[model samples]
Target: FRKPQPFEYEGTDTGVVLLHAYTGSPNDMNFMARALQRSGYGVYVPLFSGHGTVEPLDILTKGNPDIWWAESSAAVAHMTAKYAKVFVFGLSLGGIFAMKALETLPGITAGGVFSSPILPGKHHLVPGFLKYAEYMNRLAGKSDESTQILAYLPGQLAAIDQFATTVAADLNLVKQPTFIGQAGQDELVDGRLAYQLRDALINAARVDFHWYDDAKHVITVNSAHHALEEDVIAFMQQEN
Candidate 1:
């Protein structure tokens, strides 16, 4: 299997760590990372455990929520130590991790969550069946060209759902400035979850929420991506 690579762009003391979607590589975060760099911000997108590979199932099977959380925390810590201010940005599952980081790391200056799924949406039809990773792979004939962009082992999916459920209960735990983006036409996550998440962040110092009607799950790559980039950059530049 060809090993995947992470993305890093060094700049000033102000840094931003970007996280990719599940079943996605650092490639997913490149556009935003480069934008942040162009704006004179340091950027780093870490390859999540078991994610930087041709066969994603290999890594997905090996990872759980705790492992993912540790990797995310480590990235946040790394940024916090090196930069005067650090912002976290994530797409899809990566968004979930970013919120967790903002909730756990007091040093994270701010966060942007793009198309994060808290509860399963109407599009989530095959719920219980996702647990059978190998079977699902074979059934879908997993391939590089396949639309199934992510290979989620049952455990990984379960762990992700559990983390979302747990975090949903106490959104107030995250006190940092946060921007929550939801795609109006997203097939994977319901737009209402975005508002739900916003409502839960009762104690957030500032909460910026947006719903992109022209975007899908990967808002950064969709028609509304420019808006996404503009909002995030502006939010990060705000004086705290």
Candidate 2:
């Protein structure tokens, strides 16, 4: 396992900080970042703690929601220091922590939550060996497992599971302009959870919601020809 390079987007106007999903690298959101940049927002997709390393378990044990929030906050800080306005976007766990970060960073203009995981077990169940399963699967010659494990090195599935449990307890903190793109076929996150999140964010000015009938967990990435990107762009524009 190893780390993925931090991806950057050069833009002249606003900025965005993107936090990728668990066991995933910046490449996962590179297309989305570029799309946002094309629309005039600088984007930074940074590697979180225990990422780009050789051991996935390290991510489970070392990085928690706090660490994820800190990293995301730092990325936003970097951009906000340079730009007049900065928004946040994330996938799965990345989305969870972005919501958490919004609690302290009141200046965030809006949020793009892609298949966000609100309550861990409430949405999906964790295997007993969830912690080591990712790394072991990679070691056992599972190609997808290995590729995913390789995408974010020094990260662990167990750490993600633990962090997920910890973060799920506080979903009420993310009070901002929010948008959710749901995958109708997504098996990993409960579709009902998205609705629950929508209900919880009572103060959200507008919670644009969409359920893609044919998409799964990684709706945009695994979908055909970046159709997910188009949906994200539409959601971003609606955030105002």
Best by lDDT: 1
- What TM-score would each prediction reach against the true structure? 0.85, 0.78
Highest-TM-score candidate:
1
lDDT per residue for candidate 2 within 79-135, as digits (tens), equals 888776677878887887777666557578777578884655444324322444556
What TM-score, to 2 decimals, does candidate 2 have?
0.78
Residues 24-89, model 1: lDDT tens digits: 678887678878888899998998877665454555566666787788888888888888988998
Candidate 1, residue 123: lDDT: 45
Candidate 1 lDDT:
0.75
Candidate 2: regions farther than 4 A off: 122-175
TM-score of 1: 0.85
Backbone clash pairs in model 2 (N, Cα, C under 3 Å; residues 3+ apart or in different chains), count? 14
